[PDB]
């Protein structure tokens, strides 16, 4: 997980007091999911309700007999009746906890089924206008989201709110009736915990948000430097990017450490006030006794009662949050099911006797999103029955929209679509209209069942109009015989192919028919469309891939199909061989704000009508090392490790002492002699232990993160400093992308902070507890500790309950009801056309036949696994006390030894199990580090940091640049040669123009000239080769001006000083005057300090490139490399740029190489070099030294580009 997301998840959470105010003020009841239920499922809720309040009255009994057991063991009498009375309660608790999970998971399954089976329905009755807004794969990306917010908050962890409240009430009020002045004076230290929490969380969030503020800046820097890399190298700006990074990272570090300090203090203080509560409770208890003469067994239990009463309020609250979450998720779904379709199928529309005389009258339409993009102007004409038609439209006319208007996805806005001169479109039953339209769409939309069933899905919507008009719909699909498939396959000439291979009609087509060819799939789609004898045939790019044979045979079929005496066939295709004969062809076009009839006439009187657009149509067409690096790094901080060491030893040493100090107090409380002095002596020790455990935990939890930060901010530096100095072939590979390279630096380095150097400390502290506890529990009473260890071993590692539980839960949570949902939303526009309730009642059967056999076994097992989880510690403690009281009455063991060897074991087990769940991801952080470690130790082999080579002065530079031969070929595609035997010169201080074919690869001379790609060939600068120059000073005399510049998110004054950090503002004012931009900058607030936006998006294209030209002229360049500085800008800036260019070239000081195509610059050019690509193998030079005095002396291309210019 990323850092930004991890902080936003913590910041975007609402407390219960906020969700309640959000949930009350629009009447979202607490009983919303439990209103889709029969009565047979409505009273299992009551059963599971009363089978939970009873299981809460267990702890108020054990806590009431706990002190009496001890008073009875250390005084001489027996305890067997108490045990016999205490085991039966465990048994009935097991049974009452076995009931509830069974009774609840069933209900969850039921409601989770019903919501889905209503959602699918409400989705399948949208009106097209909606489908355009929320298309397809989103809806099943939201469904499975909501259906895992409601199931993880309405299961068995909704009934555990009433058990805990029952236990709360019982404990507290039993503790209050016995003696109130004692329990009141114990729960007065607890408000000080809530107050500290609310005071500290604020100081946490205030600093954490300011930490987040300084993080996205670094993200922007990294992405924006990894994107524009070849403009960072050519100006030698690898260094002045790192200072911003290091200045932006330190604020983040210091503020998040300020947060972690407060986050660590709270823990230590919560672990310190409780131990004071114990001591003051005992001290005041022993003073209400002496003043009385109320036994001592009514002081050992009140403390546990009042102290465990509040532990329930620390675990009730998350479940209420999850329940509110489930509510707001369900009420984010009962608005989708209850949306109005506005094209409703009332099943009452008066239908025609037959379809006759379709007629349009002046229909206009606007979308809902694009409320200003019109397609129609004057749609008005007539289409009569019995005779054929045909139409022709371009790729943006609206054949799709006419289809959606005859199919009636949309309604008209202005006109009307009266049919048969007495019936409007909005009176016909939509069920019956679509029943006589055969659409052959662009792509073949076939399912993944067979070749026969995709064909036989046509007649279902008609056979469904036979039973209701007399249920009988489920079985009458057998009436559809297999003899119609025979002849309808013969007609399209596919019967031979489907009969040639085995499994004639039973062969299953692939996933969306991924076995056959596209043309054959379109043939099957056409056979599907033809099979039902459609009345209004609407083709759309139907016979495109077919040859003339199948097309013309289908045409013969349609125009001679039985029952064509009364039809309106609308055959629409782009191949103009289908329109040889037609009763009328209104060729349709949209020429832009709306279509209209452009032509009219039969094909005999249309191809020769006029010299219009249809004339053009008929005329034209016719591995271990890597981590010991980290362990070397960690063990170089000598002051921060010793404090952690000492604090771990202190905590692990002084926490177990509290147990055997709690047992020396019991034995002196049943001894009326000198009770006062003993209390005075045994309370001060607990005060001291609290004061020590505060400091120990605080300093253990702070220096941990203090160590964790530095490993990050010394690995990020190495990565981001090593990536910049790498050559360009690195960035050209496939798996070396800016996104994946920027994902590592944040995610996996934050994981190295969390995982490793959090999970080391946990294991160390755990072992330090486990050694000493096992030692001084095996020393007082050896016989008991062996038995207790055997018990917990055979429990945790052999009867792992919560492990098997989640292993059975998440597997079925991960999981044909899941294959049809997917392939029903892809093929939506076929079920909207025809076939709608076959899948309304097929998902139900496939869903139900997988419930029972698995669900009932899984749920009768997972309840037996939960009951034994809730009712295990009781039996263990009972057996322990029985065995202790058994060995005592035969002399083998004393009392105090047992009472000291028991409590240590108990409390240390609880505390160890507590802190052992704070771990992170230790595995993936050791796995990623093997991916991204070779990147911080990779060699570059074109390295600018090398200071070995011939130093070069700017004084003795002539400026000649020569090439003798080149043969270049990219490694990302080693088949396309580009250059072949390029050889020419550029002498000194003279212009050299480059004209040639567009896209021939002219912008690669430049890159080789700056050493981005090494070599075959030979390049020369002042008669010396380029690989002997110490390229620091080679890149420090060139200066490019590319087609598109790139600016950064810094000020303008800094973007102009990129590379050269030592230059006054007067030079910037001087050079911005020659770029003709020192008037707009003097019209603005914060003139030379206006922070432009990211990627320079707060400027125009005519202001950006003049800033670039100012950036290129500040370096005092010796060789200038221009590329069409006046391409696609507005008039004023373009003219200013021509003025600057023609001003530079007059000041003959520097050698210049341009890429020009305007004749005004060619004339002054002193040399012109043509590039040509005769055949697709390479380019080379064909002309030399024309300079427009040789404009026509031999036959060539320069004459073209001077008469075209």
PDB file of N, CA and C in Angstrom, residues 225-293:
ATOM      1  N   UNK A 225      10.405  14.649 -13.500  1.00  0.00           N
ATOM      2  CA  UNK A 225      11.784  14.478 -13.934  1.00  0.00           C
ATOM      3  C   UNK A 225      12.013  13.156 -14.647  1.00  0.00           C
ATOM      4  N   UNK A 226      11.253  12.116 -14.303  1.00  0.00           N
ATOM      5  CA  UNK A 226      11.352  10.855 -15.021  1.00  0.00           C
ATOM      6  C   UNK A 226      10.631  10.893 -16.359  1.00  0.00           C
ATOM      7  N   UNK A 227       9.645  11.775 -16.516  1.00  0.00           N
ATOM      8  CA  UNK A 227       8.990  11.933 -17.807  1.00  0.00           C
ATOM      9  C   UNK A 227       9.888  12.692 -18.778  1.00  0.00           C
ATOM     10  N   UNK A 228      10.262  13.917 -18.421  1.00  0.00           N
ATOM     11  CA  UNK A 228      11.143  14.727 -19.238  1.00  0.00           C
ATOM     12  C   UNK A 228      12.606  14.521 -18.924  1.00  0.00           C
ATOM     13  N   UNK A 229      13.157  13.379 -19.332  1.00  0.00           N
ATOM     14  CA  UNK A 229      14.516  13.029 -18.937  1.00  0.00           C
ATOM     15  C   UNK A 229      15.551  13.589 -19.907  1.00  0.00           C
ATOM     16  N   UNK A 230      15.273  13.582 -21.206  1.00  0.00           N
ATOM     17  CA  UNK A 230      16.263  13.983 -22.196  1.00  0.00           C
ATOM     18  C   UNK A 230      16.383  15.493 -22.350  1.00  0.00           C
ATOM     19  N   UNK A 231      15.554  16.266 -21.651  1.00  0.00           N
ATOM     20  CA  UNK A 231      15.781  17.691 -21.461  1.00  0.00           C
ATOM     21  C   UNK A 231      16.471  17.996 -20.141  1.00  0.00           C
ATOM     22  N   UNK A 232      16.556  17.021 -19.238  1.00  0.00           N
ATOM     23  CA  UNK A 232      17.335  17.181 -18.018  1.00  0.00           C
ATOM     24  C   UNK A 232      18.811  16.933 -18.288  1.00  0.00           C
ATOM     25  N   UNK A 233      19.119  16.001 -19.191  1.00  0.00           N
ATOM     26  CA  UNK A 233      20.509  15.670 -19.474  1.00  0.00           C
ATOM     27  C   UNK A 233      21.170  16.701 -20.375  1.00  0.00           C
ATOM     28  N   UNK A 234      20.457  17.189 -21.388  1.00  0.00           N
ATOM     29  CA  UNK A 234      21.058  18.093 -22.358  1.00  0.00           C
ATOM     30  C   UNK A 234      21.408  19.451 -21.770  1.00  0.00           C
ATOM     31  N   UNK A 235      20.772  19.842 -20.669  1.00  0.00           N
ATOM     32  CA  UNK A 235      21.139  21.046 -19.936  1.00  0.00           C
ATOM     33  C   UNK A 235      21.951  20.750 -18.681  1.00  0.00           C
ATOM     34  N   UNK A 236      22.256  19.481 -18.407  1.00  0.00           N
ATOM     35  CA  UNK A 236      23.059  19.085 -17.252  1.00  0.00           C
ATOM     36  C   UNK A 236      22.408  19.564 -15.954  1.00  0.00           C
ATOM     37  N   UNK A 237      21.186  19.085 -15.736  1.00  0.00           N
ATOM     38  CA  UNK A 237      20.407  19.430 -14.563  1.00  0.00           C
ATOM     39  C   UNK A 237      20.063  18.246 -13.688  1.00  0.00           C
ATOM     40  N   UNK A 238      21.009  17.324 -13.520  1.00  0.00           N
ATOM     41  CA  UNK A 238      20.799  16.196 -12.625  1.00  0.00           C
ATOM     42  C   UNK A 238      20.925  16.576 -11.158  1.00  0.00           C
ATOM     43  N   UNK A 239      21.552  17.709 -10.846  1.00  0.00           N
ATOM     44  CA  UNK A 239      21.927  18.054  -9.482  1.00  0.00           C
ATOM     45  C   UNK A 239      20.956  19.012  -8.813  1.00  0.00           C
ATOM     46  N   UNK A 240      20.486  20.034  -9.520  1.00  0.00           N
ATOM     47  CA  UNK A 240      19.580  21.011  -8.929  1.00  0.00           C
ATOM     48  C   UNK A 240      18.143  20.506  -8.829  1.00  0.00           C
ATOM     49  N   UNK A 241      17.909  19.224  -9.102  1.00  0.00           N
ATOM     50  CA  UNK A 241      16.652  18.577  -8.759  1.00  0.00           C
ATOM     51  C   UNK A 241      16.732  17.909  -7.390  1.00  0.00           C
ATOM     52  N   UNK A 242      17.923  17.478  -6.979  1.00  0.00           N
ATOM     53  CA  UNK A 242      18.060  16.757  -5.722  1.00  0.00           C
ATOM     54  C   UNK A 242      17.891  17.673  -4.519  1.00  0.00           C
ATOM     55  N   UNK A 243      18.330  18.926  -4.623  1.00  0.00           N
ATOM     56  CA  UNK A 243      18.172  19.853  -3.511  1.00  0.00           C
ATOM     57  C   UNK A 243      16.709  20.103  -3.161  1.00  0.00           C
ATOM     58  N   UNK A 244      15.835  20.234  -4.162  1.00  0.00           N
ATOM     59  CA  UNK A 244      14.406  20.361  -3.891  1.00  0.00           C
ATOM     60  C   UNK A 244      13.888  19.132  -3.160  1.00  0.00           C
ATOM     61  N   UNK A 245      14.315  17.953  -3.604  1.00  0.00           N
ATOM     62  CA  UNK A 245      13.882  16.696  -3.010  1.00  0.00           C
ATOM     63  C   UNK A 245      14.274  16.625  -1.539  1.00  0.00           C
ATOM     64  N   UNK A 246      15.537  16.929  -1.245  1.00  0.00           N
ATOM     65  CA  UNK A 246      16.028  16.833   0.121  1.00  0.00           C
ATOM     66  C   UNK A 246      15.463  17.930   1.012  1.00  0.00           C
ATOM     67  N   UNK A 247      15.115  19.090   0.451  1.00  0.00           N
ATOM     68  CA  UNK A 247      14.461  20.119   1.251  1.00  0.00           C
ATOM     69  C   UNK A 247      12.995  19.809   1.496  1.00  0.00           C
ATOM     70  N   UNK A 248      12.365  19.049   0.611  1.00  0.00           N
ATOM     71  CA  UNK A 248      10.969  18.679   0.771  1.00  0.00           C
ATOM     72  C   UNK A 248      10.776  17.467   1.664  1.00  0.00           C
ATOM     73  N   UNK A 249      11.796  16.626   1.817  1.00  0.00           N
ATOM     74  CA  UNK A 249      11.664  15.407   2.605  1.00  0.00           C
ATOM     75  C   UNK A 249      11.859  15.623   4.106  1.00  0.00           C
ATOM     76  N   UNK A 250      12.660  16.618   4.495  1.00  0.00           N
ATOM     77  CA  UNK A 250      13.005  16.798   5.900  1.00  0.00           C
ATOM     78  C   UNK A 250      11.816  17.276   6.725  1.00  0.00           C
ATOM     79  N   UNK A 251      11.002  18.179   6.173  1.00  0.00           N
ATOM     80  CA  UNK A 251       9.805  18.624   6.876  1.00  0.00           C
ATOM     81  C   UNK A 251       8.867  17.457   7.142  1.00  0.00           C
ATOM     82  N   UNK A 252       8.695  16.594   6.142  1.00  0.00           N
ATOM     83  CA  UNK A 252       7.893  15.391   6.305  1.00  0.00           C
ATOM     84  C   UNK A 252       8.417  14.536   7.444  1.00  0.00           C
ATOM     85  N   UNK A 253       9.729  14.295   7.457  1.00  0.00           N
ATOM     86  CA  UNK A 253      10.324  13.486   8.516  1.00  0.00           C
ATOM     87  C   UNK A 253      10.045  14.082   9.892  1.00  0.00           C
ATOM     88  N   UNK A 254      10.331  15.371  10.071  1.00  0.00           N
ATOM     89  CA  UNK A 254      10.226  15.938  11.411  1.00  0.00           C
ATOM     90  C   UNK A 254       8.778  16.000  11.885  1.00  0.00           C
ATOM     91  N   UNK A 255       7.833  16.329  11.003  1.00  0.00           N
ATOM     92  CA  UNK A 255       6.443  16.364  11.443  1.00  0.00           C
ATOM     93  C   UNK A 255       5.894  14.977  11.745  1.00  0.00           C
ATOM     94  N   UNK A 256       6.228  13.963  10.945  1.00  0.00           N
ATOM     95  CA  UNK A 256       5.682  12.650  11.256  1.00  0.00           C
ATOM     96  C   UNK A 256       6.327  12.081  12.518  1.00  0.00           C
ATOM     97  N   UNK A 257       7.560  12.485  12.841  1.00  0.00           N
ATOM     98  CA  UNK A 257       8.121  12.106  14.135  1.00  0.00           C
ATOM     99  C   UNK A 257       7.434  12.824  15.293  1.00  0.00           C
ATOM    100  N   UNK A 258       7.098  14.108  15.122  1.00  0.00           N
ATOM    101  CA  UNK A 258       6.267  14.786  16.115  1.00  0.00           C
ATOM    102  C   UNK A 258       4.968  14.034  16.356  1.00  0.00           C
ATOM    103  N   UNK A 259       4.377  13.480  15.300  1.00  0.00           N
ATOM    104  CA  UNK A 259       3.160  12.692  15.472  1.00  0.00           C
ATOM    105  C   UNK A 259       3.429  11.411  16.251  1.00  0.00           C
ATOM    106  N   UNK A 260       4.476  10.680  15.873  1.00  0.00           N
ATOM    107  CA  UNK A 260       4.742   9.392  16.503  1.00  0.00           C
ATOM    108  C   UNK A 260       5.092   9.518  17.981  1.00  0.00           C
ATOM    109  N   UNK A 261       5.693  10.631  18.402  1.00  0.00           N
ATOM    110  CA  UNK A 261       5.973  10.820  19.824  1.00  0.00           C
ATOM    111  C   UNK A 261       4.688  10.820  20.647  1.00  0.00           C
ATOM    112  N   UNK A 262       3.716  11.638  20.244  1.00  0.00           N
ATOM    113  CA  UNK A 262       2.430  11.671  20.926  1.00  0.00           C
ATOM    114  C   UNK A 262       1.714  10.339  20.793  1.00  0.00           C
ATOM    115  N   UNK A 263       1.880   9.653  19.665  1.00  0.00           N
ATOM    116  CA  UNK A 263       1.218   8.366  19.504  1.00  0.00           C
ATOM    117  C   UNK A 263       1.832   7.291  20.390  1.00  0.00           C
ATOM    118  N   UNK A 264       3.084   7.465  20.818  1.00  0.00           N
ATOM    119  CA  UNK A 264       3.744   6.511  21.703  1.00  0.00           C
ATOM    120  C   UNK A 264       3.550   6.838  23.176  1.00  0.00           C
ATOM    121  N   UNK A 265       3.340   8.105  23.519  1.00  0.00           N
ATOM    122  CA  UNK A 265       3.108   8.478  24.910  1.00  0.00           C
ATOM    123  C   UNK A 265       1.789   7.937  25.451  1.00  0.00           C
ATOM    124  N   UNK A 266       0.747   7.963  24.622  1.00  0.00           N
ATOM    125  CA  UNK A 266      -0.571   7.493  25.027  1.00  0.00           C
ATOM    126  C   UNK A 266      -0.527   6.035  25.463  1.00  0.00           C
ATOM    127  N   UNK A 267       0.196   5.200  24.717  1.00  0.00           N
ATOM    128  CA  UNK A 267       0.289   3.779  25.040  1.00  0.00           C
ATOM    129  C   UNK A 267       0.888   3.584  26.426  1.00  0.00           C
ATOM    130  N   UNK A 268       2.033   4.210  26.676  1.00  0.00           N
ATOM    131  CA  UNK A 268       2.674   4.097  27.964  1.00  0.00           C
ATOM    132  C   UNK A 268       1.843   4.602  29.113  1.00  0.00           C
ATOM    133  N   UNK A 269       1.050   5.644  28.900  1.00  0.00           N
ATOM    134  CA  UNK A 269       0.203   6.166  29.964  1.00  0.00           C
ATOM    135  C   UNK A 269      -1.009   5.283  30.249  1.00  0.00           C
ATOM    136  N   UNK A 270      -1.594   4.689  29.207  1.00  0.00           N
ATOM    137  CA  UNK A 270      -2.676   3.731  29.401  1.00  0.00           C
ATOM    138  C   UNK A 270      -2.163   2.490  30.114  1.00  0.00           C
ATOM    139  N   UNK A 271      -0.922   2.090  29.834  1.00  0.00           N
ATOM    140  CA  UNK A 271      -0.331   0.970  30.557  1.00  0.00           C
ATOM    141  C   UNK A 271       0.173   1.352  31.943  1.00  0.00           C
ATOM    142  N   UNK A 272      -0.071   2.582  32.399  1.00  0.00           N
ATOM    143  CA  UNK A 272       0.412   3.047  33.683  1.00  0.00           C
ATOM    144  C   UNK A 272      -0.679   3.427  34.659  1.00  0.00           C
ATOM    145  N   UNK A 273      -1.810   3.922  34.158  1.00  0.00           N
ATOM    146  CA  UNK A 273      -2.900   4.287  35.065  1.00  0.00           C
ATOM    147  C   UNK A 273      -3.631   3.077  35.653  1.00  0.00           C
ATOM    148  N   UNK A 274      -3.686   1.960  34.925  1.00  0.00           N
ATOM    149  CA  UNK A 274      -4.400   0.778  35.401  1.00  0.00           C
ATOM    150  C   UNK A 274      -3.747   0.220  36.661  1.00  0.00           C
ATOM    151  N   UNK A 275      -2.415   0.196  36.684  1.00  0.00           N
ATOM    152  CA  UNK A 275      -1.696  -0.348  37.820  1.00  0.00           C
ATOM    153  C   UNK A 275      -1.851   0.533  39.049  1.00  0.00           C
ATOM    154  N   UNK A 276      -2.105   1.826  38.856  1.00  0.00           N
ATOM    155  CA  UNK A 276      -2.477   2.698  39.962  1.00  0.00           C
ATOM    156  C   UNK A 276      -3.891   2.397  40.426  1.00  0.00           C
ATOM    157  N   UNK A 277      -4.780   2.073  39.484  1.00  0.00           N
ATOM    158  CA  UNK A 277      -6.154   1.743  39.845  1.00  0.00           C
ATOM    159  C   UNK A 277      -6.203   0.531  40.763  1.00  0.00           C
ATOM    160  N   UNK A 278      -5.495  -0.543  40.389  1.00  0.00           N
ATOM    161  CA  UNK A 278      -5.383  -1.716  41.259  1.00  0.00           C
ATOM    162  C   UNK A 278      -4.968  -1.332  42.678  1.00  0.00           C
ATOM    163  N   UNK A 279      -3.883  -0.568  42.803  1.00  0.00           N
ATOM    164  CA  UNK A 279      -3.319  -0.265  44.111  1.00  0.00           C
ATOM    165  C   UNK A 279      -4.278   0.550  44.963  1.00  0.00           C
ATOM    166  N   UNK A 280      -4.852   1.617  44.403  1.00  0.00           N
ATOM    167  CA  UNK A 280      -5.776   2.423  45.193  1.00  0.00           C
ATOM    168  C   UNK A 280      -7.021   1.634  45.569  1.00  0.00           C
ATOM    169  N   UNK A 281      -7.500   0.773  44.667  1.00  0.00           N
ATOM    170  CA  UNK A 281      -8.633  -0.070  44.999  1.00  0.00           C
ATOM    171  C   UNK A 281      -8.361  -0.946  46.202  1.00  0.00           C
ATOM    172  N   UNK A 282      -7.235  -1.664  46.181  1.00  0.00           N
ATOM    173  CA  UNK A 282      -6.888  -2.505  47.321  1.00  0.00           C
ATOM    174  C   UNK A 282      -6.717  -1.684  48.595  1.00  0.00           C
ATOM    175  N   UNK A 283      -6.054  -0.527  48.495  1.00  0.00           N
ATOM    176  CA  UNK A 283      -5.780   0.268  49.686  1.00  0.00           C
ATOM    177  C   UNK A 283      -7.059   0.740  50.351  1.00  0.00           C
ATOM    178  N   UNK A 284      -8.031   1.212  49.576  1.00  0.00           N
ATOM    179  CA  UNK A 284      -9.281   1.660  50.176  1.00  0.00           C
ATOM    180  C   UNK A 284     -10.144   0.488  50.631  1.00  0.00           C
ATOM    181  N   UNK A 285     -10.048  -0.650  49.936  1.00  0.00           N
ATOM    182  CA  UNK A 285     -10.735  -1.844  50.388  1.00  0.00           C
ATOM    183  C   UNK A 285     -10.293  -2.281  51.769  1.00  0.00           C
ATOM    184  N   UNK A 286      -8.985  -2.286  52.017  1.00  0.00           N
ATOM    185  CA  UNK A 286      -8.482  -2.688  53.327  1.00  0.00           C
ATOM    186  C   UNK A 286      -8.720  -1.655  54.416  1.00  0.00           C
ATOM    187  N   UNK A 287      -9.309  -0.506  54.090  1.00  0.00           N
ATOM    188  CA  UNK A 287      -9.670   0.492  55.084  1.00  0.00           C
ATOM    189  C   UNK A 287     -11.160   0.520  55.360  1.00  0.00           C
ATOM    190  N   UNK A 288     -11.991   0.047  54.423  1.00  0.00           N
ATOM    191  CA  UNK A 288     -13.398  -0.185  54.746  1.00  0.00           C
ATOM    192  C   UNK A 288     -13.618  -1.492  55.499  1.00  0.00           C
ATOM    193  N   UNK A 289     -12.618  -2.374  55.552  1.00  0.00           N
ATOM    194  CA  UNK A 289     -12.733  -3.598  56.339  1.00  0.00           C
ATOM    195  C   UNK A 289     -12.489  -3.314  57.813  1.00  0.00           C
ATOM    196  N   UNK A 290     -11.348  -2.698  58.117  1.00  0.00           N
ATOM    197  CA  UNK A 290     -10.946  -2.461  59.500  1.00  0.00           C
ATOM    198  C   UNK A 290     -11.962  -1.577  60.210  1.00  0.00           C
ATOM    199  N   UNK A 291     -12.535  -0.613  59.491  1.00  0.00           N
ATOM    200  CA  UNK A 291     -13.558   0.244  60.071  1.00  0.00           C
ATOM    201  C   UNK A 291     -14.885  -0.480  60.256  1.00  0.00           C
ATOM    202  N   UNK A 292     -15.103  -1.594  59.554  1.00  0.00           N
ATOM    203  CA  UNK A 292     -16.362  -2.326  59.683  1.00  0.00           C
ATOM    204  C   UNK A 292     -16.432  -3.051  61.024  1.00  0.00           C
ATOM    205  N   UNK A 293     -15.498  -3.964  61.262  1.00  0.00           N
ATOM    206  CA  UNK A 293     -15.460  -4.715  62.510  1.00  0.00           C
ATOM    207  C   UNK A 293     -14.771  -3.907  63.602  1.00  0.00           C
TER     208      UNK A 293
END
